[PDB]
């Protein structure tokens, strides 16, 4: 029974690092559990050489404005935009629809003809 999906094992990792931390003189033992890319894929990340992980600014230009957006609509309270709508717009813009090309559609239309045309070819090959 694996916590990660079968696909993700060859990529992902579960890192548990438990530390003693002091609080008001006492010591509480607190752990960081996290799911994380393996170091090969990690130095692929830090190299800016890695797919499946996309840079932020190519999604929407200049995050220095985007995360630093302070709300201006009829208000002098310059509080930042909330967390949830930023995460929401992020995961929306990630998940949008790509214009699948008719070329790939044509390759797939050729691939649909696999079995019928193969049987027709196998029948005429004798």
């Amino acid at each position: 029974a694996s916590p990660l999906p079968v696909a993700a094992l060859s990529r992902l990792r579960i890192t548990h690092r438990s530390f003693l931390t002091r609080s008001r003189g006492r010591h509480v033992c607190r752990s960081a559990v996290g799911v994380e890319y393996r170091p090969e894929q990690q130095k692929k990340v830090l190299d800016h050489s890695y797919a499946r992980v996309i840079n932020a600014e190519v999604v929407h230009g200049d995050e220095q404005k985007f995360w630093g957006e302070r709300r201006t609509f009829y208000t002098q309270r310059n509080i930042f935009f909330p967390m949830w709508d930023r995460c929401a717009q992020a995961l929306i813009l990630i998940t949008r629809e790509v214009p699948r090309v008719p070329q790939e559609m044509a390759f797939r239309l050729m691939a649909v003809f696999l079995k019928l045309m193969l049987l027709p070819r196998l029948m005429m090959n004798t």
Binding site: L116, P120, M124
Partner: peptide
């Protein structure tokens, strides 16, 4: 599936060619 294969196995070469022609005309 087995009956169709058994029926096709008993057909001649000309019959198989005619069946192929019919399959090319109808289904293509």
């Amino acid at each position: 599936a087995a009956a169709a294969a058994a029926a096709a196995a008993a057909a001649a070469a000309a019959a198989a060619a005619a069946a192929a022609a019919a399959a090319a005309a109808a289904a293509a």
